[PDB]
Amino acid sequence: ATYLIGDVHGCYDELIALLHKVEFTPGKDTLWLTGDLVARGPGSLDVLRYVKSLGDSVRLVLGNHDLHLLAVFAGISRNKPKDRLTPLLEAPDADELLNWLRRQPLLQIDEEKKLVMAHAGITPQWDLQTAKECARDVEAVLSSDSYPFFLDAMYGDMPNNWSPELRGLGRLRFITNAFTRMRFCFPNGQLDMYSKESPEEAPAPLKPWFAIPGPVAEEYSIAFGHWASLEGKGTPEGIYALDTGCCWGGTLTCLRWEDKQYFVQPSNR
Numbered sequence: 001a002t003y004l005i006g007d008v009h010g011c012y013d014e015l016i017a018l019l020h021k022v023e024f025t026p027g028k029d030t031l032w033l034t035g036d037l038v039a040r041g042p043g044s045l046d047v048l049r050y051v052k053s054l055g056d057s058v059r060l061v062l063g064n065h066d067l068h069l070l071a072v073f074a075g076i077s078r079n080k081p082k083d084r085l086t087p088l089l090e091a092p093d094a095d096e097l098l099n100w101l102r103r104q105p106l107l108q109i110d111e112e113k114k115l116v117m118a119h120a121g122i123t124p125q126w127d128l129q130t131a132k133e134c135a136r137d138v139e140a141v142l143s144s145d146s147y148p149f150f151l152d153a154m155y156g157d158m159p160n161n162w163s164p165e166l167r168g169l170g171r172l173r174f175i176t177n178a179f180t181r182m183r184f185c186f187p188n189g190q191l192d193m194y195s196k197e198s199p200e201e202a203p204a205p206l207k208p209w210f211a212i213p214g215p216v217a218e219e220y221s222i223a224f225g226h227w228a229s230l231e232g233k234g235t236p237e238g239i240y241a242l243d244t245g246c247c248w249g250g251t252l253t254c255l256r257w258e259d260k261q262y263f264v265q266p267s268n269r
C-alpha cells in the first residue's frame with residue numbers, strides 16, 4: 001500500500017501511532033512524507049532517526065523547517081528556542097542525520113500513480129519539466145560540500161515571479177520559495193510571501209496556488225503539506241492538502257492512495 005502523511009513537526013509519538021493504525025509494513029508498503037519533519041514538536045531527533053532508517057520505503061520532500069534546521073546546523077542561522085531542536089543538534093549522530101537530510105529531494109514524482117509531491121505544492125507558473133529542473137538544481141546545491149553558502153543565499157522574499165531568464169541568487173531564492181513557502185498567488189501566478197491565513201480570511205485578490213490552473217495540476221494529482229491554516233480543506237479534485245496541524249494541537253493525517261482512505265491521529269499536545 002501507499003501512505004501519504006503531512007507535516008510531522010517532531011510529533012514522533014503521533015507518527016508511530018498513525019503508522020501502527022494502518023499496519024505500515026516496510027517492504028510491502030511505501031510512505032510519502034510532505035516534509036517539515038522537525039521543529040515545534042518534541043521529538044525531532046527520533047523522527048529523523050526513524051525516517052532515515054526506512055530507506056527506500058519512504059519518499060520524502062524537504063520543507064522550510066527542514067531547511068532552517070540545516071541552516072542552524074551549518075551556523076548560518078540562529079536557533080530559536082521555540083523550535084525545540086537542541087536535542088537533535090546535540091545528538092552524537094547529528095552529523096549523520098543532517099548530512100542525510102540535506103541529500104533528500106524537493107520533489108517526488110510517481111508516473112504510474114500520476115502523483116506529484118512537494119512541500120508547498122507546484123506553482124502554476126511551472127510545467128513538470130521546469131519543476132524537475134528546478135528541484136534538481138537546488139538539490140545539487142544542498143548535497144554539495146558548499147551547501148552553507150546556498151542556505152545563506154536562500155533567505156529572501158524576491159523575486160516572486162518565475163521566468164526561465166532568472167539567473168543566480170534570485171533563481172535559487174524563487175525555486176526555494178515556490179517549493180517550500182508558497183501559499184497564495186496573485187492572479188498572474190506571482191507568489192505572495194506574507195499571507196498565511198486560510199483562503200476565506202485572506203485579502204483579495206490573493207488566491208490559493210491550487211486555484212490557478214497550472215500545467216502540472218491539469219495532468220497530475222498533487223499532494224502537499226505546509227499550509228496548516230488550510231486545515232486540509234477547500235481543495236479541488238486532485239489536490240491533497242495533508243498538513244492538518246499536528247504540532248499545533250490539530251491532527252496528523254494519513255492518506256492511503258489505493259482507495260483514497262483517510263486515517264487520522266489526534267495530537268497529544
Ligand SMILES: [Mg+2]
Pocket residue numbers: 007009036063065226227243
Ligand atoms: Mg509545517
Ligand SMILES: [Mn+2]
Pocket residue numbers: 036063064065119180225226227
Ligand atoms: Mn512548511
